[PDB]
Structures are given as C-alpha cells and as structure tokens.
Design an enzyme around this catalytic site. Structure first.
Site, PDB file in Angstrom:
ATOM      1  N   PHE A 140       0.588  -1.176  -0.098  1.00  0.00           N
ATOM      2  CA  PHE A 140      -0.131   0.375  -0.112  1.00  0.00           C
ATOM      3  C   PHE A 140       0.938   1.218   0.020  1.00  0.00           C
ATOM      4  O   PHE A 140       0.737   2.460  -0.896  1.00  0.00           O
ATOM      5  CB  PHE A 140      -1.338   0.063   1.237  1.00  0.00           C
ATOM      6  CG  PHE A 140      -1.541   1.953   0.932  1.00  0.00           C
ATOM      7  CD1 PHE A 140      -2.777   1.481  -0.190  1.00  0.00           C
ATOM      8  CD2 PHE A 140      -1.336   2.167   2.605  1.00  0.00           C
ATOM      9  CE1 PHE A 140      -3.642   2.409   0.318  1.00  0.00           C
ATOM     10  CE2 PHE A 140      -2.144   3.358   2.552  1.00  0.00           C
ATOM     11  CZ  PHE A 140      -3.715   3.200   1.482  1.00  0.00           C
ATOM     12  N   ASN A 146      -0.862  11.692  12.493  1.00  0.00           N
ATOM     13  CA  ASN A 146      -2.008  11.007  13.001  1.00  0.00           C
ATOM     14  C   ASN A 146      -2.618  12.153  14.933  1.00  0.00           C
ATOM     15  O   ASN A 146      -2.190  11.742  15.397  1.00  0.00           O
ATOM     16  CB  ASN A 146      -1.783   9.423  13.545  1.00  0.00           C
ATOM     17  CG  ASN A 146      -2.397   8.394  14.040  1.00  0.00           C
ATOM     18  OD1 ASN A 146      -3.837   9.462  14.170  1.00  0.00           O
ATOM     19  ND2 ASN A 146      -2.311   7.384  13.857  1.00  0.00           N
ATOM     20  N   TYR A 163      -3.990   9.949  22.979  1.00  0.00           N
ATOM     21  CA  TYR A 163      -3.268   9.906  23.509  1.00  0.00           C
ATOM     22  C   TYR A 163      -2.989  10.815  24.835  1.00  0.00           C
ATOM     23  O   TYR A 163      -3.177  10.601  26.343  1.00  0.00           O
ATOM     24  CB  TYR A 163      -1.802   8.951  23.358  1.00  0.00           C
ATOM     25  CG  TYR A 163      -1.826   8.356  21.869  1.00  0.00           C
ATOM     26  CD1 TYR A 163      -2.850   7.728  22.220  1.00  0.00           C
ATOM     27  CD2 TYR A 163      -1.334   8.505  21.430  1.00  0.00           C
ATOM     28  CE1 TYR A 163      -3.270   6.042  20.904  1.00  0.00           C
ATOM     29  CE2 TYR A 163      -0.871   6.890  19.850  1.00  0.00           C
ATOM     30  CZ  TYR A 163      -1.621   5.866  20.443  1.00  0.00           C
ATOM     31  OH  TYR A 163      -2.280   5.351  19.401  1.00  0.00           O
TER      32      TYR A 163
END
Ligand SMILES: CC(=O)SCCNC(=O)CCNC(=O)[C@H](O)C(C)(C)COP(=O)(O)OP(=O)(O)OC[C@H]1O[C@@H](n2cnc3c(N)ncnc32)[C@H](O)[C@@H]1OP(=O)(O)O
Lengths: 156, 159
Positions: B26, B122, B129
């Site tokens: 990918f 991200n 987090y």
C-alpha cells in the site's frame, strides 16, 4: 589503547557510576545488585559493553537490548552510550557504536536503533556521520509515553 | 463485524507476514520488507522471543506487535512496535481494541510504563493519547528516533 568488551559482574560498580554520569548529563532507581541480576542473570534484561583503557580503567559504556522491527525483524536498540569527559574525541564512542554493530550482525540483527535528545547535536551529528538516519526528522515519528494512571486509562 | 483479539500462535505467522506485506505494498515500499515467515516463527515462538503478537480475528485482519524494553530512566517498559488493521476493516475500533489489550498486558505484568512511536500525521491518535495523560516525548523533550539501517550497520561491523 582502548578495548570495547562485554561487561562482567565485576564491572557493575563502575557501570553504576557511569549510569549516574549519563543521567546527570541528560538532566534526569538501580542498585549495583539490580545491575548484576538484570544485566547478567538468566534471562538478562539488557546487555552492557564497557570501554576500558589498557591498571586498566573503565571510561565509557553502552547498554543495549534486543527489539524487533516488522519490516526487518531482529533489531538491537542502543539505550545508553557515554564516555567520560576527559576521554571524549579520541574515537571511543565511535568504537562503542562499531562494537554494537558487530554484535548486531553476530546475533542476526540487520539494524540498530537509538533515541537522542535534539539539544544533543554533537551526538546526533556523530550518528549521522556513522550512517544513521533521523527518522523523526525524515518520517515524523514522535515518541509517546504513558505512565501510571495514563496506562491504566489506556487499558480502559 | 464480530472480532476476537488473541495471542498469536506460531501458525499465524503466514498471516502476519501477509498483513505486513499488504501494508508495505500500500505504501509502495514492498522492497523494504526483509522479514521472513521463518523469522517471525523463530523470533516469536522459541525460548527467548524478540516480540509478542496479538492478532485480530473474525480470517486474521490485523495485528499488534510489542516487546518489553529496559529504560535506564524508568525501568521496565512495554513498547508497542506496530499495529495494522486491513483497510476493509478500518472504522470498526479494532486498532483501539488491540492497543487497550497491550496496555492490559503491561499492567498484568505489574508494569505501568507504555511507550510507542506515532507518526505526526496522526492527530486523532496524538490528541487521544495526550487526553489520557500520555506525554509526547518528541514534542515535550525533543527525543528523536535514530536508525542505523542495513548498509550502515554492515559498514560499521567492518564488512
Ligand atoms: C543513544 C543515547 O545514549 S544518545 C547519548 C550520547 N551520549 C552523550 O552525549 C554523553 C556525552 N558525550 C559522550 O559520551 C561522547 O562525546 C559521545 C558518545 C557522544 C561521542 O563519543 P566520543 O568518543 O567523544 O566521540 P568520537 O571521538 O568517537 O568522535 C565523534 C564526534 O563525537 C561528537 N562529540 C560529542 N562530544 C564531543 C566532545 N566533547 N569532543 C569531541 N567530539 C564530541 C562530535 O560529533 C565528534 O565529531 P567530529 O570529530 O567530526 O568533530
């Protein structure tokens, strides 16, 4: 002359002193006993190399352990590396790094990883000179750490 | 889809490699996958494994690979090396379930230090987090991830 060699239990006193030097250099709970148990045990948690001037005296060290990459497989991670101030810039740190590479191949590890603080440009420059890539800068990797309650919350 | 997260078994190594290759393909980085099924078997399922693996199973559709580390700063730490879920199964919470389980492993062993690396694209992950109490050490403390790759390592070792 200098030799980089595997630590022996008898080095634990010298290694503990040098761990304390590196912790202070970096600006922030291990007994000599813990070192002997963890670093040589059965079952060792980690592995220590010493730089020794040839009586002989220990002037630097490294600590590494075995980790894994999903793209490459068996990998070493160099956790600590430190040379006493009097002994810097005479090739010892480069020799420790070369020894970790030798150990890597011997143990079927194609590659090795480390983490370094971005204020420590002289170290970063050396690693780049020896062939390392900064994957934080190249790829955008950020280290995260959960402690105590954060890990408990992560565990839901 | 109904999914279980379970410890990998040696016989899952074919599926783990198939997933690793699917990701690499990918990303157009197929040539970078040097790991073998035999390595995953030897490195995971002998006496002193290099890693542990959880798989997501409906057909194995995802994995999380981790190991313990000894940090000279905080002692015993779990390190999450990689989590992948096939795209067809994204949006279903499978990645969140795997990470939760890895966090439980750490706690069960009486370890409460958990470490990973997250790519900077991200933001969703980073925000969550931080919200849970995690610290971004790269941003907070300036930690950079370095790697001596295969050619560099061979050269250093005197090949
Ligand atoms: C992986 C983590 O542990 S990162 C932590 C690295 N450890 C530290 O920074 C602790 C303090 N410094 C040291 O322990 C050592 O200086 C090391 C390990 C960084 C380098 O080892 P040395 O034996 O000094 O270096 P060596 O002689 O092999 O030469 C390489 C380079 O070291 C770097 N360096 C760092 N400090 C010095 C110094 N005081 N004097 C000369 N070079 C230094 C430079 O990049 C130098 O490069 P150059 O010769 O092209 O100018």
């Amino acid at each position: 002359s200098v030799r980089i060699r595997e630590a022996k239990e008898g080095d634990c006193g010298d290694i503990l002193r040098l761990i304390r030097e590196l912790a202070e250099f970096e600006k922030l709970k291990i007994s000599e006993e813990a070192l002997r148990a963890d670093g040589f045990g059965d079952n060792p948690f980690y592995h220590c190399l010493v730089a020794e001037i040839l009586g002989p005296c220990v002037v630097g060290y490294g600590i590494y352990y075995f980790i894994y990459s999903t793209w490459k497989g068996r990998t070493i991670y160099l956790e600590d590396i430190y040379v006493m101030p009097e002994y810097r810039g005479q090739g010892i740190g480069s020799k420790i790094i070369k020894k970790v590479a030798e150990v890597a191949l011997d143990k079927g590890c194609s590659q090795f990883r480390l983490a370094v603080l971005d204020w420590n440009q002289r170290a970063m420059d050396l690693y780049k000179a020896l062939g390392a890539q900064d994957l934080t800068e190249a790829e955008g990797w950020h280290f995260f750490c959960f402690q105590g309650e954060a890990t408990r919350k992560l565990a839901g």
